[PDB]
Amino acid sequence: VLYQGVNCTEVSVAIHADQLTPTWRVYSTGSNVFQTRAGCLIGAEYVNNSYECDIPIGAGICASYQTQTKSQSIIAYTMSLGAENSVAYSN
Amino acid sequence: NSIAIPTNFTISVTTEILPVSMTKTSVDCTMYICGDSTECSNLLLQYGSFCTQLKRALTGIAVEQDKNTQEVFAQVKQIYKTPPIKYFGGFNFSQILPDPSKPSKRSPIEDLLFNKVTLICAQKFNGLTVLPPLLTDEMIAQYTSALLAGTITSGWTFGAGPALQIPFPMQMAYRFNGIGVTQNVLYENQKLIANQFNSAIGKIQDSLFSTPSALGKLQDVVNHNAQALNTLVKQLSSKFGAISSVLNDILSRLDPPEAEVQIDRLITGRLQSLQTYVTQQLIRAAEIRASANLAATKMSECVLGQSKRVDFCGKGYHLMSFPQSAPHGVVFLHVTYVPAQEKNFTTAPAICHDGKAHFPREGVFVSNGTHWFLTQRNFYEPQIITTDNTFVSGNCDVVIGIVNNTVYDPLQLELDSFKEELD
Amino acid sequence: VLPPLLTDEMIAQYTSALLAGTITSGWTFGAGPALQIPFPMQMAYRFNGIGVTQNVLYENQKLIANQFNSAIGKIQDSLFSTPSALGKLQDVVNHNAQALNTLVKQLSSKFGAISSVLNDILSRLDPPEAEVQIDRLITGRLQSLQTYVTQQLIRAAEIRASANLAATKMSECVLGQSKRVDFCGKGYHLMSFPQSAPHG
Amino acid sequence: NSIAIPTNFTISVTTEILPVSMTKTSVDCTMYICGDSTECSNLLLQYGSF
Amino acid sequence: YEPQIITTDNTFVSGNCDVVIGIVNNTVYDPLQLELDSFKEELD
Ligand SMILES: *[C@@H]1O[C@H](CO)[C@@H](O[C@@H]2O[C@H](CO)[C@@H](O[C@@H]3O[C@H](CO)[C@@H](O)[C@H](O)[C@@H]3O)[C@H](O)[C@H]2NC(C)=O)[C@H](O)[C@H]1NC(C)=O
Ligand SMILES: *[C@@H]1O[C@H](CO)[C@@H](O[C@@H]2O[C@H](CO)[C@@H](O[C@@H]3O[C@H](CO)[C@@H](O)[C@H](O)[C@@H]3O)[C@H](O)[C@H]2NC(C)=O)[C@H](O)[C@H]1NC(C)=O
Ligand SMILES: *[C@@H]1O[C@H](CO)[C@@H](O[C@@H]2O[C@H](CO)[C@@H](O[C@@H]3O[C@H](CO)[C@@H](O)[C@H](O)[C@@H]3O)[C@H](O)[C@H]2NC(C)=O)[C@H](O)[C@H]1NC(C)=O
Ligand SMILES: *[C@@H]1O[C@H](CO)[C@@H](O[C@@H]2O[C@H](CO)[C@@H](O)[C@H](O)[C@H]2NC(C)=O)[C@H](O)[C@H]1NC(C)=O
Ligand SMILES: *[C@@H]1O[C@H](CO)[C@@H](O[C@@H]2O[C@H](CO)[C@@H](O)[C@H](O)[C@H]2NC(C)=O)[C@H](O)[C@H]1NC(C)=O
Ligand SMILES: *[C@@H]1O[C@H](CO)[C@@H](O[C@@H]2O[C@H](CO)[C@@H](O)[C@H](O)[C@H]2NC(C)=O)[C@H](O)[C@H]1NC(C)=O
Ligand SMILES: *[C@@H]1O[C@H](CO)[C@@H](O)[C@H](O)[C@H]1NC(C)=O
Ligand SMILES: *[C@@H]1O[C@H](CO)[C@@H](O)[C@H](O)[C@H]1NC(C)=O
Ligand SMILES: *[C@@H]1O[C@H](CO)[C@@H](O)[C@H](O)[C@H]1NC(C)=O
C-alpha cells in the first residue's frame, strides 16, 4: 500500500493513534516501511539490487514480486535503465 | 548557363525545443466537491459515477505522461559511456557530455536548461495532488548520456543494432558523404570543422543563457497547468447562487431540507468546474502526446541516424544531432552543414568531344571562363574532365546547350607514351 | 471575427517567393543561400534523385516540358470542373459557420424560463423572481458557450495537426526532394509547387 | 527470371489540399449571456471565472 | 566485412600526404601499369 504524498512518520503516528481513516491496517515489520517521493510504501521490502521496472510506483522506484532470501515477497527497488556498455573507442 | 557553386561552408548548430510531458495530477472529487461532509457526499452519490470517469481520465493522462517520456528517452538498449580519454579528433563535446564534478551528472547545457525553467502540498490543495514522474531527472539525464556516448563513439550503428566503434572524424566524413560532400573535404578541413563546431556550441550556450524567451514552450506548458489548477481551486470560493460558498456554514446554519438545496447548487457548480478542468486536461494531454511523438521521431531520425528530410533535423543539410534533457521536455542541438561563399560559374549539360555527348557521373560541369572542369555540386573542387569522370550516351546533336571541350582519356595517353616507337 | 495577421496578399507573396526560389535554385535555397542553376539541370538532378540518369532528361527535354505543361493545364481544368475539388477548406468554413449559427440560435431557447428574452423578464417581474428566471437562462447560455468552446478547441487541435502536416509538406516536398513514398504525390517525387487558398 | 523494365515515362502532376487555419473568433460572455443587463451580470458574477 | 585489395579503381586521389591526419603508408595497386609491364616490357 502506497499512501501518496505523506511522510511515513505521519502515517505511523496516525496508525498508532487510530486516526487513519481506512480502517484496514497493513502489518508493519519495521523493515517493510519505506519512504519514497511518491509517498509512504508499506508492505514491500526495499532492496539495493536494481531490476527492470515491473510495477511502476514513481520517482524511479518500482516494485515486483520476487523469490528473495528463500519465500516470495513484494520488493521495491530503483529501476535499472539498462545494462552498461563501454564502447572501445580509439583514434 | 549560370550556376553558383559553394566554395566554403559553415557548421551551424541550431536548437529545437519540444515538450514531452506535463505535470501529472490526481483529483478526489469527494474532497473538492464535498470536503469532509457526509451529507454533501450522500447528495453527490445521486449524480452517478461521474467521479469514476474523472478519476479514469486523470489516471489515463498520468500514465500517458510516463509513456511519453519512455517513448522519447528510453530508445537505447544499453547505457553507453564515453571513453576515459575525451579526445574526438578536436571536437569538444564538454558542454553536452555529463559533468562528473557536480552532484547531478548533467552537462553544463542541461544545468542551464534546468535552471532557466521554474512532500507537503502547501499550494492549491483541495483534493488536488501532483504525482511524481516515473523517471527522475537523473534517469532522464542517464538516458541522454547514453545517447551521447552512443552517437559519439559509434554513429548510426548503435541505433541500427550493436554499437560499432568508429573514430569520430571518420563518422563525420561519412555524414559528409551523406549530405553529398566527399570525405577529403572533411579530412583536409578537419581543424576548421572542429573549430566551427566548438564555436557553435559556445554560441548555443550563450544564446540559451541570454534570451529570456528561449525556453518558452516548456514554461508555457507549466504555466497552463498552473493556471488550470489555480482556476479549479478558485472555483470553490464561488457560490453559484447558494447563500454561501463554505459548506460548513451551510451545514451549521440550516436544517437538512434546505441545506440540501444549497448543497445541491454547490454540487452542480463544483461538478461543472471539475468537468471543465478534466476536459481541458484531456485536450492539452492530446497536444502534449503529439509533441512527444514528434520528439520521439526526432530522437529516432536525427540522433540515432542521419535524416535526408529537409528542415526536419535543423536548418541546412543535416549532419548529426545531440539530445539534451529539460524539465518536461527535450532540446535537440541540430548540427548541420550550410554552404557559404558561393562563386559564379558558367555551366553546360554535357561535353561534346568526338561527336559523342559526355555527362557527369557525380558532379556538374563548370567553367572559369577559359577552361572546363567537373566539380561536386555542394563544394567547389575543380577536376579535369576525363572518361573516368563522365559517361557517354548519344551524340552531340541531341542535347540542348552542349559545349565543345576536350575529354582526357588516360589510357590512350598512357599507351602512346608507353610504346609509340618500339625502338 | 478577428482578421488573420497575414492578409491574402502576404500569403501570396510568400508563395511567390517559394516558387521563385525553387524554380531558380532548386533545393539549395531551402538548405542555405539560394544558388542559381538552369532549370533543365535542376530537373536532371531530380531525375538522378529518383534513380534515372541525366541523359534521359537531356535527350527527352522537349517531351518532359510538354508533358509538364499539359499536366498543369489539366490541373487547371480539374480544379475548375469538379465542384468537390476543394471540399476540405469549404468543410472547415462550413463547420465554423455551423458552430456560430448554433451558438446564436441557442439564445432563442428558454431552458425552462418563462421567456427567452431577458428584457421581457426584467420588464415583467420584480427582482426576487426575475433572478430565478435569469439564473435558468444563465445556466442554459453558459452550457451553450462551454459546448461551443470545447468544439472549437477540438477542431483547433485537428487544424493544428493539418497545419503541421502542411508545414512538413512545404519543408520536404517544395524546399527539397522527398524519398518518402506517397508523401509528396503519387509516383517518384520530382518536385512540388505550393499555392495559397482560403484557410489552406 | 522475368522482369518488366519501363521504356517510357509520364510527368504526372497531382493535387493535395490541406487546411492550415480556421476563422478566428472572440466571444464576450457578458453580452451573450446577459446582454445589456446589469442584474443578469451580477447574477453571472456568482458563477466565478468561467 | 568483405576485404578487397586497395586499388586505383577502389579509391580516389585528392591532395598530398601532408594534410590528412592519421594517413598510413601502404601500397595502392594500379592494374593498368602492371598489365602494361607484363604486356610489352621486352618487345623481343
Ligand atoms: C572558409 O571560412 C573560414 C571561416 O569560416 C576561413 O577560416 C578563417 O580564416 C580567417 C582569415 O585567415 C581567420 O581570421 C584570422 O584568425 C586569427 C584568429 O587568431 C587571427 O590571426 C586574425 O586576426 C584573423 O582574424 C579565421 O580565424 C578563420 N576561421 C577559422 C574558424 O579557422 C577559411 O579561410 C575560409 N576558406 C576559404 C577557402 O575561403
Ligand atoms: C572545451 O571547451 C571548454 C569551454 O567550453 C574548455 O573549458 C575551459 O575550462 C577552464 C577551466 O578548466 C575555463 O577556465 C579557465 O581556467 C584557468 C584557471 O586557472 C585559466 O587558465 C583561465 O583564466 C580560465 O578561467 C576556461 O574558460 C574554459 N574555456 C572556455 C573557452 O571558456 C575546455 O578546456 C575545452 N576542452 C578541450 C579539450 O579543448
Ligand atoms: C513516349 O510517350 C510519348 C507520349 O507520352 C510519345 O510522344 C508522343 O508521340 C505521339 C506519336 O508520335 C505523338 O502523337 C502525334 O502528335 C502530333 C501532335 O501535333 C500529331 O502529329 C499526331 O496526330 C499524333 O497525335 C504525341 O504528340 C507525342 N507526345 C508528346 C507529349 O510529345 C513518345 O513517342 C513515346 N516514346 C517512346 C519511345 O515510345
Ligand atoms: C582557369 O583555370 C586554369 C587552370 O587552373 C588557369 O590556367 C592555369 O593558370 C595557372 C596560373 O598560375 C598556370 O600556372 C597554369 O599552367 C594554367 N593552366 C592551364 C591549363 O592553362 C586559368 O588561368 C584560369 N582562368 C581564369 C579566368 O580563372
Ligand atoms: C564543335 O565542333 C564541331 C566540329 O568538330 C562543330 O561542327 C561543325 O560546325 C560547323 C558550323 O559552321 C559546320 O560548318 C561543320 O560542318 C560542323 N562539322 C561537323 C563535323 O559537325 C560544332 O559546331 C562545334 N560546336 C560548338 C558549340 O562549337
Ligand atoms: C611514408 O613514407 C615516406 C617516404 O616515402 C616517409 O617520409 C619520410 O619520413 C622520414 C622520417 O624520418 C624523413 O626523414 C624523410 O625525409 C621522409 N621522406 C619523404 C620523401 O617524405 C613517411 O614518414 C612515411 N610515413 C609513415 C606513416 O610511415
Ligand atoms: C519525513 O520527516 C522527517 C522528519 O520527521 C524528515 O527528516 C524527512 O526528510 C521527511 N521525509 C521527506 C520525504 O521529506
Ligand atoms: C589520439 O591521439 C591524440 C593525439 O594528441 C592523443 O592525445 C589521444 O590520447 C589519442 N586517443 C586515444 C584513444 O589513444
Ligand atoms: C554571374 O555573372 C553574370 C554575368 O556573367 C552576372 O550577371 C551575375 O549577376 C553573376 N552572379 C552573381 C550571383 O552575381
Numbering used by the authors:
A (entry chain A): 610 to 679, 689 to 709
B (entry chain C): 710 to 827, 849 to 1153
C (entry chain B): 860 to 1059
D (entry chain B): 710 to 759
E (entry chain A): 1110 to 1153
Q: What wording appears in the published article?
A:
The JN.1-sublineage KP.3.1.1 recently emerged as the globally prevalent SARS-CoV-2 variant, demonstrating increased infectivity and antibody escape. We investigate how mutations and a deletion in the KP.3.1.1 spike protein (S) affect hACE2 binding and antibody escape. To investigate the effects of N30 glycosylation introduced by S31Δ and two RBD mutations (F456L and Q493E) on the structure and function of the spike protein, we determined the cryo-EM structures of the recent SARS-CoV-2 variants KP.3.1.1 and JN.1.11 along with engineered variants JN.1.11 + S31Δ+Q493E, JN.1.11.1 + S31Δ, and JN.1.11 + S31Δ. The spike proteins exhibited three conformational states: “one RBD up,” “all RBD down,” and “flexible” (i.e., one or two RBDs disordered in the density maps due to flexibility).
KP.3.1.1 contains only one additional change compared to KP.3, a deletion in the NTD (S31Δ). Compared to the JN.1 spike protein, KP.3 carries two mutations in the RBD (F456L and Q493E) and one mutation in the S2 domain (V1104L). Previous studies have suggested that the S31 deletion and potential N30 glycosylation may alter the local spike conformation and enable the RBD to adopt a more “down” conformation, potentially enabling escape from certain classes of pre-existing neutralizing antibodies. S (S31) and KP.3.1.1 S (S31Δ) in both “one RBD up” and “all RBD down” states revealed similar overall conformations and no change in intra-domain distances (Cα RMSD = 1.1 Å and 0.9 Å, respectively), indicating that S31Δ and N30 glycosylation did not induce any substantial conformational changes. In the cryo-EM structure of the spike protein of KP.3.1.1, we observed N30 glycosylation and a 180° flip of the F32 side chain, resulting from the S31 deletion in the 30NSFT33 motif. CryoSPARC 3D variability analysis demonstrated that all spike proteins had similar proportions of up and down RBDs, suggesting that S31Δ does not influence the conformational dynamics of the spike protein. The S31 deletion and N30 glycosylation exhibited a minimal effect on the spike protein conformation and did not affect spike binding to hACE2 or to the broadly neutralizing antibody BD55-1205.19 However, addition of N-glycans at N30 knocked out the binding of the NTD antibody C1717 and altered the glycoforms at a spatially adjacent N-glycosylation site at residue N61. Structural alignment of SARS-CoV-2 WT, JN.1, and JN.1.11 spike proteins with KP.3.1.1 showed that the NTD and RBD exhibited greater rootmean-square deviations (RMSDs) than S2. V1104L has little effect on any conformational changes; V1104 and L1104 are both surrounded by a conserved hydrophobic pocket formed by P1090, F1095, I1115, and T1120 in the same protomer. Similar conformational states (“one up” and “all down”) were observed in the spike protein structures of KP.3.1.1’s ancestors, including BA.2, BA.2.12.1, BA.2.75, and BA.2.86, which showed both “one RBD up” and “all RBD down” conformations.
